[PDB]
Amino acid sequence: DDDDWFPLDIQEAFVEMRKRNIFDVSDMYTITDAWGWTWE
Amino acid sequence: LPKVEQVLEVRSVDSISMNLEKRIEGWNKCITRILGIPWGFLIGAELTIAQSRISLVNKIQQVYRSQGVQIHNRHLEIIVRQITSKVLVSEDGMSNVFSPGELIGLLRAERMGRALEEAICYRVVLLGITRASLNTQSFISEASFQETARVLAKAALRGRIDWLKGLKENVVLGGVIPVGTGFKG
Amino acid sequence: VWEILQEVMQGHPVLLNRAPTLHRLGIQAFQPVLVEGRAICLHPLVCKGFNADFDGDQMAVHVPLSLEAQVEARLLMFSHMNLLSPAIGDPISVPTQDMLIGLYVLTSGNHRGICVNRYNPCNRTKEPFFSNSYDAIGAYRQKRINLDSPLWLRWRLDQRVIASRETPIEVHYESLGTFYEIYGHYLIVRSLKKQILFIYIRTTVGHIALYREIEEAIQGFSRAYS
Amino acid sequence: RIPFLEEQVRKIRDGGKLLTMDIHRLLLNEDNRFDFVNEIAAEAKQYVENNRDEYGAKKAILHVLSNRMNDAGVYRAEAYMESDPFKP
Amino acid sequence: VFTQGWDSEKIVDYRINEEEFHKISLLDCDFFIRKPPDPDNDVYDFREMYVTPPDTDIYAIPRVLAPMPQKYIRCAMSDYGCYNVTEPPIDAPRDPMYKSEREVSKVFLTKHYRNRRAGDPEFALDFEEIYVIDSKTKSITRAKVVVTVPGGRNRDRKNDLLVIRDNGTSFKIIPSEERDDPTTVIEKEEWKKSRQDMERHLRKLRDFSVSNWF
Amino acid sequence: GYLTRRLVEVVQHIVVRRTDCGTARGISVSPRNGMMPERIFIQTLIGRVLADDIYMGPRCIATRNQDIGIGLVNRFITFRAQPISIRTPFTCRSTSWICRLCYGRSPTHGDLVELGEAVGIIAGQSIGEPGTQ
Amino acid sequence: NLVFHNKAINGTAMKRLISRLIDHFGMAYTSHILDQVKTLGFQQA
């Protein structure tokens, strides 16, 4: 051990990757949310 | 030296560390359970990529510091990224865009997932020193160095058009190498 | 024909490359000088940087032809443009064994305690106060002082007094107001109204010789630049 | 002002260490060290195409560098050629 | 305005005009003693003194561990410290290769003889009244001088020499004829330290206690 | 020898072509979690371009697109700035090339990497040549 | 304006001095300085 290791479960792994700014909720978007259509 | 050779050309992900194998086999299962939307595949791929890169860099730097030599991390990262820059599509989803067995880039796969709605499933594959070099955009030099038999056969069968954007390609050709004084623009 | 050969090779760069090209600096460019013999003469620093061996290391000599090759060899492949290793940035051209031994003998000094005096000095002069380092080197060349003999060199109040965080051993504060601060390596004579009158340094000829040679090299380079 | 310093100055001027300083000084205004090489090569080619034998004192690259150093306020010899007057 | 308060070390709840004080900067402190008007600014007044961290406006009362003069006395200042030359990092094309600091630790205030001016044709210094100013303890005390010279008070105070040793804690007044040249004391201290180190190294051998030091 | 021959052949097409790929992501290097000793934390940041401004109260130590020297690392370890975002080859936007800001400072001359420098061959050689000893 | 040295200078000291002179003066000055240091060291040895 004694190295950089993410947690075992995913719930706190998400807060860990949000702490290191690897991924965030502002990066979740598809063509729908980007081009802004509502008939889908 | 054998440690460096076996951590660079990964025979299996559990050979370098069983913790990494356990973490990956937990990540993929728990990210198929929850977040079934392509965002789940995306976040799982990103997490696996980050963990694999960090672990590989740490192991290489530890095996280098144990002997007394000092090497900067950028040289290691340049190779580590090329080791784990490609993703592998699973064998259960087939469409007119991609085949079940393919090795596509990570950024291309993520952008296609953000673009296309068709079910696209991909899992991060850790290539090796030899395996990653056998799958390149050129067949003259970077592919025809080890086999020289099938890398030419498949290229002639597909009719591959190779753009001379490399160094050894132009070395074998004989023209000016696009590095340094040859790099125009 | 030899005169014409010299006139041709006066300013034509030549490339030297060892047969085993293990390191990245194995291929360098030099300016050829006509020498008599059957062996290529190279600089000791470049030889140490090119992994010199006890056995005879074969050297391949290549001569560029085109103008572009000559410009690239003169502006990029010279040794004075590549002195830092690309691994982390450490100087690849460092003084060799003999140079390090010479520098260590110069800057080592000599004995200071029981090895220089037999009995305790508490019961009972050094070399005269040399106003300039030139006089010290001249006295050393005249064989009047030894290389390890301590001396006092008048320092021109440069205020760059190199020492450690150690208070002076004694401060002779007289009645008129001029007190002498005696340290382990130097002496500061200070008047009443906070004025550094004199500064004397207790050192040998090797330290001042090295300092003078480095300073004079810097100054000569700066002057020849103009 | 060190009195005994003329010997190494003459050694610098004679051995040819002035060019090593001039190249480093000229590489202080250019971003890429490759475009500078290309420009010097092009200028040398243009100067050797006009007059073949009259490329300078001995060569053209040294002539181009001397011309570039003389236009900045630093007097340099013609193509960095200074023969030894003490050769019998 | 002349103001004196309790001896507790805390703020005075106001600020003082530094134009009427002496600013004696130390390593980790700075002192302020009131200055009465005078041609040459050397007259002190130890009735009012303030301590403050370096470059700050938080004034406080220092620690007094000796009886202080209650009258205008003419003194002279002399610092006692050691230079600290460090090798700073170079992240510039012409970054300085070295850095020099004085790092004063003690300040000595030697009272003049009979409060005479420096321009007096018969000027002298009184070494029996020396006030040190510590920087680590924020204290200002007196110097336990040891006057060892034949003559007593009838001896003229023009042939004297204050020798300071032991990190500014030992004071001795001796005549200027029996002084020691710097090389002598340097060699003495070096010889003592070298002999101590040599006896340490050899003590760890089995042939000790049956040997001789020649 | 074989290890160097393989490592060079792995990365050859990586040549600095652009000045700024335009990325807005950076790796987070912290001493409390990533680098237990101080020497490793210093060696990781030398020659790296910052990805986000490092603030200390209302004053900024260093802004984006700024190289990091030993002085900046000393200021960081003195002011106790744990979250540090730097630009690395991992956060670049291409696998066939890298930009000047993602690579950083070249140890050969001491500034940004000039366009057209074969960083891949240099990396392969600098990783292979220490393997002999 | 170089630092005056009064202690022994080993290989690491020379390496650090050269690394600092390259950053303070440049490679042009450092080459001549190293050449003169080599000459003096050979003479002394």
Next chain:
Amino acid sequence: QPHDTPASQLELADPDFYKIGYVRSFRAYGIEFREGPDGYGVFASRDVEPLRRARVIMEIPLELMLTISKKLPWMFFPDIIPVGHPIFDIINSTNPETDSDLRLACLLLYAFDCKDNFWQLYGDFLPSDDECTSFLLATEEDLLELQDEKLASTMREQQQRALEFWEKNWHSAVPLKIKRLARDPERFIWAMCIAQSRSINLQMRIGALVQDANLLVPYADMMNHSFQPNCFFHWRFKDRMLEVMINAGQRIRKGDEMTVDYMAGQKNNFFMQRYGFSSPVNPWDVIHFTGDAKIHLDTFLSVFNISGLPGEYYHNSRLSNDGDSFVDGAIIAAARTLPTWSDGDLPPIPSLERKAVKELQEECHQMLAEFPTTSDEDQKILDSMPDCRRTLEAAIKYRLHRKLLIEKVIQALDIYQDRILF
């Protein structure tokens, strides 16, 4: 016999002015600094023949000058303000768009109170409060004497703003670190005047960061102003040194006055507002005409040999040099400000232009009589006072230059009306 040169009238400056910089990494090639009654100036001491490339005459390092960025994160590349000092709260509490001289003035005041700093030794050569030509250090009498209402109002507003900033930031409850910087309210005004009259905006690059900042550079503020400059500032990023380089192709002889361009392409009012300087040959000063008469443009440019695009007008000497000595910046500014008409290649009618020139002349006469004084009276007043205030001198020179520009426009209109019929 001594050579008669424009630099020979002045005497050589103090050698300490160059000695305090030569101890640092400062060099001055082929230049000689000379002090006179107006102030210091930079002259040439060597004939510079027409060069193919630029030649450097000054090398000013970065560690000798102040620098504050123009964007929101204020980064001082020469790090002289330690973290925690309360002066950064004064620098930061400013609008990042309208007031940039306040931050430079505060940084200069702090540099005046920091040891081992170059500006503690260079401050002895800066102009005092009596030899400065800025209008911040002026009185109400001189501002009313300017005979310009808008400029006087702007200067009064700026003085008020300076005083209000000093009163709001330097209050009584301030710690002593800030109070000792500017004890009197005149010190801050002088600091603002120096920061406003000697600032240079230049895009500098250090390491990998390329930003634009406002920097007060020493030995380069001595360069005078000229609308036909001879030198320009260049930033060298390899050594972090600013350079002053002569233009490529221009011939410089011994004794010439080395000059650069301050605010290229600005009106003569902003010059008096910022630098307190006025020039009668300004090729950009605007004269406002309310009349509807329109002169012909192409004929007006052809008669005065003003050949070039409307963005760059120059006098072509090789067309006519001795014949046209009248052609200066004044006629160029006139041709740029005169109401002109042009409809294709239609030739002008002499009657229409002869009727328009008299209307323009009577408009110039009615706008010139608006001033209470005349030209000769101001010309006698300027030399009637041998040693007067610098602000009053600047104001009377401004009025004289305005009147001389009007007279030059009138004379040029006369030359055009009498030379259109060859």
